[PDB]
Amino acid sequence: SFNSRESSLADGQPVRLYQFSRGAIRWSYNSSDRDITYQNQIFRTVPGGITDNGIICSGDPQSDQFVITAPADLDVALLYKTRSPSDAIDLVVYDMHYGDAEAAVSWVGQIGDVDWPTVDSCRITCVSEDELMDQPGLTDTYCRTCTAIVGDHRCKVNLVPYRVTLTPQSVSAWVISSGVVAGYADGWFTGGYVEWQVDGDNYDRRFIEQHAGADLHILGGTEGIPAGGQLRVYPGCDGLAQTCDDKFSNLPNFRGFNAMQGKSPFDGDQVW
Amino acid sequence: SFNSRESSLADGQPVRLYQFSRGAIRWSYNSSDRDITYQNQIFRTVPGGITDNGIICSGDPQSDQFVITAPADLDVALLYKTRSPSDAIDLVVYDMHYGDAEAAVSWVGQIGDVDWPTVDSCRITCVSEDELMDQPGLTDTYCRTCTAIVGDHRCKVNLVPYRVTLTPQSVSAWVISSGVVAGYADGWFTGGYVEWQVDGDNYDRRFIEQHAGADLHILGGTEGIPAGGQLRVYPGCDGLAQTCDDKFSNLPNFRGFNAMQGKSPFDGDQVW
Amino acid sequence: SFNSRESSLADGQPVRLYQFSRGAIRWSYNSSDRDITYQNQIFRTVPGGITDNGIICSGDPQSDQFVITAPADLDVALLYKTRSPSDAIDLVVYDMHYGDAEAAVSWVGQIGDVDWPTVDSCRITCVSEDELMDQPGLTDTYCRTCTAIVGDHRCKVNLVPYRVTLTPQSVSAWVISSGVVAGYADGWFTGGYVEWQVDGDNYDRRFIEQHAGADLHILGGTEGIPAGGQLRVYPGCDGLAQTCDDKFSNLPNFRGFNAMQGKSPFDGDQVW
Amino acid sequence: VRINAPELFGGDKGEGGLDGTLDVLFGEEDQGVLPRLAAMLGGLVPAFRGVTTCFYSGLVTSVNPYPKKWEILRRGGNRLWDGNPWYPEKQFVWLADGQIKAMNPAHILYLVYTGRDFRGLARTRMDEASWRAAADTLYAEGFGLCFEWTRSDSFKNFCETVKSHIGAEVYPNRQTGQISIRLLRDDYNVADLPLFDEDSGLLEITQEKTGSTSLAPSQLIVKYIDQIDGAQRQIIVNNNAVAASQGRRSSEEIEFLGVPTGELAGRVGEREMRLKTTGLKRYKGVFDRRARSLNPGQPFLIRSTPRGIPETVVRVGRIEDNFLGDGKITLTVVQDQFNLPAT
Amino acid sequence: QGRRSSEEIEFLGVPTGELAGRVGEREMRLKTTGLKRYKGVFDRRARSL
Lengths: 272, 272, 272, 343, 49
Ligand SMILES: [Fe+3]
Ligand SMILES: [Fe+3]
Ligand SMILES: [Fe+3]
Prior knowledge:
Chain A is mostly beta strands and 272 residues long. Chain A is built from three helices and 16 strands. Strand 6 of chain C pairs antiparallel with strand 15 (309-321) of chain D, so a sheet runs across the interface.
């Protein structure tokens, strides 16, 4: 009846539904003045209303953004206030008419940017998957180092054995200290990242600038790190062939070119 | 008195005249509420009025367009509704004051684009000859083929003996069939064009995708082709030297380079 | 108290002062309705008021202009009406509150452009020193000529001995004639400039197209040259090494490359 | 200079070698005319002052008449500055056991601004304190660079490249009128920095720019040139945390040809990665006269309880103030996340 | 001028140095004479321009 209602000249009762999902956690909002139950999901009513500006599909990712307006107290947007969540918040938009149990999917995407122009409002800019095609695609260089992030699909190195679970001893503004890591050689954890559970099955990740003794340096500060929460810390690969094989014994998968050639052409001037 | 009237502070009676000409056919329109006779030419009065936006001469062809506003039923603009006429409609604009027999030429150009934003109006964009200087001017390539359109001033081939006048047997959506052409070898007419008289001394031209037996394929469809009108069909040149000389015996004027050189430099690496 | 007054919620009495300086001559203006004395300097009140549009510091010289609006009879701006003064008019902007003897410097720059959109107003565009970084910085070419303006810090040639002080005999639209220069060889003054005192310690400079006999050709016309005022005329250097040494004996400082090499590479094809 | 290599290309049995005498004229202020050059060339021979020139005479090749192209390495920086070097104690930075004599970028910018051969601005127009502090900090960090001028472009392009390499802002001070340089480093005390609040000089904050984290790169490729040999080299910087979340690999290439050592390139690449993947929060605040003395690059604190924004450190960006008329002072600020690690 | 300033202009079409200097003098005079630009509004008397 959704299509029939759209074609109807007197039963038009538009209502737009938004679904923000991050793994196992979902946030449901509706633009009407009362909650709507759809597919066993109830959508909350935001005091003040939630509205968008329209959907544009012109083939230009930079121009085809989707804008959401909502109060500054919106739960899903509140997360971005202090620090952007590590994972992207997928957004799905449905369209349905009051009194009908059928809805149609209109827009699908993820959060691109969030800002709070006024205390009584917040503007969210949503981007589609098409915008991820503007970055280069070379991803190849003939250099000495590995040119591969430890654990990627190219290194084929399993980090689960190297996982270390610990409770930090003391947390400071920029340094998190723990005695368990003090037993490892300096720089063992350099290049690794720290992941811990925020809510449900979602974890927030932070990279490590440097590891020295019992003190760990966290890039961008330690804000948001629970002082007593359980933390998982993985090591980091420098990328050198000696580092790759002595520590991880992954030399066969070494993607770097240590000593094949640095400059030698076959159309130079004098070989000697 | 035209200049005197322009300088006059109390006799200003502006009236703008438009003259659309296509060969032997002329269309005359005026912006006033009554017909004006000038140079033995009477200009019709369009119910609703005809007006422009102004004349700009800044040296930039892209910016110095001339816009005409007129009802959607305008005769000259009605031609563009289905398909653009093959020939360009030259436009000349005169300026005169009511009661005076002298007029001054203001703008000269041709139709650039036509659109019908509303049922009660139509907007015509007129371009000047200066805009034709944006396209490249290389017009030269060292390739095997002729690189010349059959019949151009470079080929110097007379197509009048090859003209064929015929009445089509059957006309379809995309194919025009005639038995007379069935007596020619397949591909004889490929690359040619069909011209027929529309009105007066003006003809509309259509290119031919392919010729096979008794059926002719027309690029862009056969819409606008009269089912019983007289049609003139010319052949087409493939551009190969063998094709040029065997069929037309125009080898001396052959502009192509068949076997002079494909890559051979005089500063290469090894001649053998 | 200036900062205290700015922080004050009830004593806000803004007043903006402008100081146009050119060497030993200063012009003082204020935006209020009465003259203000500051640092023993009294600022005139312009009938009609003087106001700006705001200060922008975005790091882009093209965009961070400062605009001044004032009547068309403004004394400082009146100079630009006929010809731009040779020297740049430095501008300093102060901020002070009525009743307080302390002021704060806000903007510093020089006149960039002046125009008179209306008889009752004039708009002045002021540019900062950051805009002078858009021009190239190569300033080096391996050519035969000197590539140095006579008298610059690179030529190290003292023009004071060559200074000639004279009273012109006759002044025409484009030619200034004097018999004293008639005693010099043709082209002696070619490339030089004429400087004379306009007011105070500021002089206006004009270049010379050509010198022939008793007649001097002035680039851009002779308008603004006093018919009886004292004029100082300096010679000009052609830039050739023979010209540089025979006339000025500055060959050791000759910056040109007469006969070192014109094309000769060390990686060519055939030396002979 | 006695260059002895008559058999470099195998001698007679090969293609020859390089044997001869090389004379170098750097072009000092008092440089004289070389008798040999003028005698050999003849004619009106000037002193060739102000430009470095060399005069070679001897064997170039043998057997074949096709001489080979040459490559010459040359250090510079001291013979510049005309006659008066500025703060020479920190002009050069030594790297790789003295092999690379890098120059302080602050000195490069100072020469470009005040150089008589480049712009010739009066030395009095530059705030000595700020530039000296920047040079001292750069020398302490051992952050040197090498460059060559062949683009013949505007001063703005080269200055922007230098600023991006070092991460500094150059602006004409509104108050004193001199050119000031500020480095983007975490070298500030929280207390002394000014605080702005709704009741302390903040009018309205409109833009929030929450940003996103699922996007942004996971791998960064930095390409640099080694000055020992001049051969292209690159280093790889990885973001394991973001990489794990990313469904598919993403990479970008950034060129820092001014960097002469791989370690320095990695130091700056870590800064770039942290900046681009930490999720900066951008704010567009509106302030009253209390924010009158701020300048570009100056960090300050902002608090607004109704918006739920705690005390946050931000760095000034675009400035647009209106002292007369509307009275609107509007500033654009970004969260403070700029820092150059030393390791 | 307090400090030296220079710009480079290419006139590759010029085959002789004297002609290049002739046009360069024109360019210098144009760019350093301080032209005054006006944006006037006229009635029909300026129709034939
Ligand atoms: Fe690895
Ligand atoms: Fe042909
Ligand atoms: Fe000279």
